[PDB]
UniProtKB/Swiss-Prot annotation:
Expressed by the venom gland. Belongs to the venom Kunitz-type family. InterPro entries: Kunitz_BPTI, Kunitz_BPTI_sf, Prtase_inh_Kunz-CS, TFPI/VKTCI-like. It comes from the Eukaryota. Serine protease inhibitor homolog that blocks voltage-gated potassium channels (Kv1.1/KCNA1, Kv1.2/KCNA2, and Kv1.6/KCNA6) (IC(50)=0.13-50 nM). GO terms for cellular component: extracellular space. This is Kunitz-type serine protease inhibitor homolog dendrotoxin I. Residues 7-57 form the BPTI/Kunitz inhibitor domain. Negative results: does not inhibit serine proteases. The record marks L9 as: Important for binding to potassium channels. GO terms for molecular function: potassium channel regulator activity; serine-type endopeptidase inhibitor activity; toxin activity.
Length: 60
């Protein structure tokens, strides 16, 4: 399901020690900016590669 609301919640790292740096869709720009994930908190919008982010958040 391309362009899902899960990509609209911005980065969701949570309060849990800092551990999985990745990317999130920057709805200021138009692409996946980088962010730092934590460990056990927040929704999702966790995208490893920028393409992979735009495939689901910006459409394939």
């Amino acid at each position: 399901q391309p362009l899902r609301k899960l990509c609209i919640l911005h980065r969701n790292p949570g309060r849990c020690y800092q551990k999985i740096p990745a990317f999130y869709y920057n709805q200021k720009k138009k692409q996946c900016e980088g962010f730092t994930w934590s460990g056990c908190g927040g929704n999702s919008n966790r995208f490893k590669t920028i393409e992979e982010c735009r495939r689901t958040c910006i459409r394939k």
